[PDB]
Amino acid sequence: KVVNPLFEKRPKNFGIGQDIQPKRDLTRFVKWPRYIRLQRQRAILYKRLKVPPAINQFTQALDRQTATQLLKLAHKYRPETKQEKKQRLLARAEKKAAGKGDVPTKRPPVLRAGVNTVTTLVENKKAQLVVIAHDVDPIELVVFLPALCRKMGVPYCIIKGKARLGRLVHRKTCTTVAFTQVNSEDKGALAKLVEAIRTNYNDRYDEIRRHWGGNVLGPKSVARIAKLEKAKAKELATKLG
Amino acid sequence: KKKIRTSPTFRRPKTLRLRRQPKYPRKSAPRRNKLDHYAIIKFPLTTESAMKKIEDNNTLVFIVDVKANKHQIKQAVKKLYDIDVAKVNTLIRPDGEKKAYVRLAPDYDALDVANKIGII
Amino acid sequence: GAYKYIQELWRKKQSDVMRFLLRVRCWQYRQLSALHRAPRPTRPDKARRLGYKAKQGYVIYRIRVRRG
Amino acid sequence: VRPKVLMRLSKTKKHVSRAYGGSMCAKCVRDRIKRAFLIEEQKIVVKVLKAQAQSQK
Amino acid sequence: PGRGAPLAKVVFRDPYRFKKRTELFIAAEGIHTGQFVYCGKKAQLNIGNV
RNA sequence: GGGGCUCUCGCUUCUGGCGCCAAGCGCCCGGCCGCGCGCCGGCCGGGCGCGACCCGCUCCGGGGACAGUGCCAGGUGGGGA
RNA sequence: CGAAGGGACGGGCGAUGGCCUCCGUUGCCCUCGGCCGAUCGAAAGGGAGUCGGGUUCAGAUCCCCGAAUCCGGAGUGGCG
Numbered sequence: 005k006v007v008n009p010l011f012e013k014r015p016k017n018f019g020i021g022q023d024i025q026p027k028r029d030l031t032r033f034v035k036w037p038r039y040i041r042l043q044r045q046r047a048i049l050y051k052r053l054k055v056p057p058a059i060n061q062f063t064q065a066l067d068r069q070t071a072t073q074l075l076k077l078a079h080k081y082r083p084e085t086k087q088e089k090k091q092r093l094l095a096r097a098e099k100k101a102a103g104k105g106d107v108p109t110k111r112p113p114v115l116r117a118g119v120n121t122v123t124t125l126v127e128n129k130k131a132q133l134v135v136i137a138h139d140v141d142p143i144e145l146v147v148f149l150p151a152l153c154r155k156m157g158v159p160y161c162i163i164k165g166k167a168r169l170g171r172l173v174h175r176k177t178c179t180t181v182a183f184t185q186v187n188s189e190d191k192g193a194l195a196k197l198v199e200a201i202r203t204n205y206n207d208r209y210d211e212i213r214r215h216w217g218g219n220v221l222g223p224k225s226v227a228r229i230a231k232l233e234k235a236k237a238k239e240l241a242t243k244l245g
Numbered sequence: 246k247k248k249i250r251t252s253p254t255f256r257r258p259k260t261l262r263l264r265r266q267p268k269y270p271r272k273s274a275p276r277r278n279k280l281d282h283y284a285i286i287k288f289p290l291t292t293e294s295a296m297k298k299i300e301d302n303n304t305l306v307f308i309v310d311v312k313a314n315k316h317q318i319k320q321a322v323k324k325l326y327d328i329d330v331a332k333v334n335t336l337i338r339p340d341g342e343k344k345a346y347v348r349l350a351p352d353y354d355a356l357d358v359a360n361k362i363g364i365i
Numbered sequence: 366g367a368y369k370y371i372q373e374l375w376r377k378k379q380s381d382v383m384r385f386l387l388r389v390r391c392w393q394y395r396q397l398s399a400l401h402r403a404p405r406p407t408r409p410d411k412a413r414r415l416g417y418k419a420k421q422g423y424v425i426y427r428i429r430v431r432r433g
Numbered sequence: 434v435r436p437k438v439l440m441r442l443s444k445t446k447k448h449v450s451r452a453y454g455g456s457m458c459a460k461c462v463r464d465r466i467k468r469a470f471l472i473e474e475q476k477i478v479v480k481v482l483k484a485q486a487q488s489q490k
Numbered sequence: 491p492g493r494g495a496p497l498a499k500v501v502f503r504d505p506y507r508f509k510k511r512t513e514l515f516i517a518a519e520g521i522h523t524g525q526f527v528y529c530g531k532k533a534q535l536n537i538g539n540v
Numbered sequence: 541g542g543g544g545c546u547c548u549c550g551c552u553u554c555u556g557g558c559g560c561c562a563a564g565c566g567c568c569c570g571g572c573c574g575c576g577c578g579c580c581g582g583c584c585g586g587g588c589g590c591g592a593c594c595c596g597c598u599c600c601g602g603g604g605a606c607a608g609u610g611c612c613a614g615g616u617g618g619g620g621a
Numbered sequence: 622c623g624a625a626g627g628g629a630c631g632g633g634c635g636a637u638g639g640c641c642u643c644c645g646u647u648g649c650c651c652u653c654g655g656c657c658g659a660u661c662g663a664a665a666g667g668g669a670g671u672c673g674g675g676u677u678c679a680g681a682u683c684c685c686c687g688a689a690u691c692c693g694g695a696g697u698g699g700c701g
């Protein structure tokens with residue numbers, strides 16, 4: 005057609021010693037600072053050593069679909085903010101002398117947060133469900149709660165997120181959340197999750213206690229012990245038959 | 246992707262540095278200009294080699310402060326004597342203080358300026 | 366309370382749960398400087414029975430000392 | 434002249450009106466012209482002889 | 491100075507950005523200025539190559 | 541004609557030269573025109589993708605539970621007191 | 622054994638102060654980047670550009686007179 009004949013492909017090539025290299029993505033090879041390397045080599049080192057089952061058990065958290073329905077239920081039971089607590093008590097304390105008097109008012113069943121609160125609840129069977137976060141960074145504060153909730157016999161679930169439990173108690177993070185009494189309009193939602201949780205945690209907990217974790221190798225190490233196998237496993241089966 | 250590291254080096258990224266806006270000044274008032282026009286010029290020289298330079302060379306000679314430069318001397322003579330200055334030469338004496346040979350313009354002459362000052 | 370369980374777990378420093386944590390933290394603490402602020406106490410129960418509260422104005426520094 | 438007085442001179446007193454003038458002498462400018470010609474002309478007969486050697490298997 | 495052996499100031503072409511890189515190779519006996527030296531596993535077995 | 545399973549995943553060796561800051565092929569979007577029948581005709585700008593294969597968990601290679609360090613024990617020790 | 626560049630005409634998103642036609646600035650965004658080591662260290666090393674005559678009881682390549690020269694600044698253009 006009528007295209008300009010002065011338009012011309014000049015294809016440069018990128019062999020060795022030829023025209024120089026382009027700006028390709030070097031993101032594997034860069035000099036990272038020593039807080040980034042510190043936390044990437046830390047995450048590799050939790051899968052190179054034998055991780056005991058009291059630390060392994062916070063990896064097999066609850067599935068993404070059925071932990072979402074838990075948070076959808078535990079959203080009506082979030083503790084109140086002070087900005088609703090102050091606005092109530094300007095009218096709730098107003099209703100003593102005008103004109104109720106006692107006003108017992110039936111303290112609503114809400115969530116109870118904190119690992120020191122919810123441990124008191126399970127030791128005397130108050131709890132109904134113990135929601136536990138998986139990535140407490142000093143991971144020794146909840147390493148006894150799957151042990152303790154099995155012996156007391158309440159259901160417990162590991163939930164993928166610490167700041168997602170914290171975002172429903174109006175703080176930054178929250179370690180554990182415990183369900184106690186529930187309203188009668190949605191008690192049936194508890195007898196949908198509890199028999200679906202404790203088949204994963206309580207009914208199989210002797211299985212967890214010998215289920216060691218970690219102890220896999222690098223992708224370079226696991227693929228160098230596949231060439232030595234496939235070199236061995238190409239004539240040793242051919243020797244027979 | 247679509248971020249790309251086209252360098253092997255992690256450089257520290259630049260952040261938002263903002264100017265100060267303090268809740269109170271650290272000093273209550275700006276300090277007074279204690280080297281003013283009257284603190285530049287202390288006293289003239291009336292020596293036999295100073296009067297010999299007022300006549301033949303068309304220049305005044307003062308004893309100035311040691312802290313002053315040739316620009317402050319040229320402005321202080323211009324203010325509190327109402328005379329214009331061509332150039333200023335300065336030296337620090339072995340006495341310790343600084344002598345200034347201020348040369349006037351060819352418009353003026355120092356013989357009828359020293360009459361008004363009264364050093365003659 | 367759950368501070369009574371942390372107090373008994375740190376009395377089990379040779380157990381296979383606790384020797385794993387005391388090696389992965391000792392690796393992590395070796396890769397940092399000798400003067401280093403911690404953003405929170407590593408032992409939140411041992412700190413608070415020595416005078417630590419979770420208020421503003423109480424800070425934690427991690428110190429590395431050559432032994433011998 | 435000295436290098437710091439070389440900035441108060443005009444432009445024609447510091448170079449020669451020629452490509453690479455003022456940096457190289459004319460003897461090696463004459464060589465680098467016929468190096469860049471004859472090497473790239475050699476890379477034509479290198480390129481054609483291996484492209485026209487497409488008669489075998 | 492104080493080493494009694496010549497050095498070869500060898501200028502390479504930088505393969506990643508447009509620059510020239512000079513070097514200070516130990517002079518193998520028989521090299522001369524203006525010849526090409528080749529560094530790498532595909533270099534030929536000649537005097538001066540690496 | 542094609543595959544299998546190993547070569548091939550490499551493009552630079554007559555010369556004291558030049559080499560970066562993208563061409564090209566696209567997929568869109570704007571600004572007017574004006575086809576005023578839409579992947580669509582005329583002029584100016586801006587972006588993105590392939591060109592420059594895809595994933596991955598250590599920057600790469602060499603050692604390695606040794607060396608080394610901490611502590612204690614035996615020797616040796618006018619080097620020194 | 623460090624996240625060690627706070628810079629860059631330009632490009633541009635513009636908050637927009639105005640001889641708001643713009644045009645000097647301004648902040649951030651996209652774009653580019655090793656004086657790779659703070660700093661000190663020579664009145665004999667490196668280091669742009671001043672000489673002639675005259676002058677004082679004592680000063681001069683420094684003061685007078687006469688000839689120059691270098692560096693920096695010129696947006697409101699200083700004219701060719």
Ligand SMILES: [Mg+2]
Nearest residue numbers: 334335336337
């Ligand atoms: Mg002086």
Ligand SMILES: [Mg+2]
Nearest residue numbers: 445446448449
């Ligand atoms: Mg010339």
Ligand SMILES: [Mg+2]
Nearest residue numbers: 601602603604
């Ligand atoms: Mg080895």
Ligand SMILES: [Mg+2]
Nearest residue numbers: 617618619620
């Ligand atoms: Mg001895």
Ligand SMILES: [Mg+2]
Nearest residue numbers: 618619620621
């Ligand atoms: Mg002795």
Ligand SMILES: [Mg+2]
Nearest residue numbers: 625626655657
């Ligand atoms: Mg730098």
Ligand SMILES: [Mg+2]
Nearest residue numbers: 660661662663
């Ligand atoms: Mg100095």
Ligand SMILES: [Mg+2]
Nearest residue numbers: 663664666668
């Ligand atoms: Mg000097």
Ligand SMILES: [Mg+2]
Nearest residue numbers: 663665666668
């Ligand atoms: Mg000198």
Ligand SMILES: [Mg+2]
Nearest residue numbers: 677679680681
């Ligand atoms: Mg003398």
Ligand SMILES: [Zn+2]
Nearest residue numbers: 458460461462
């Ligand atoms: Zn030559």
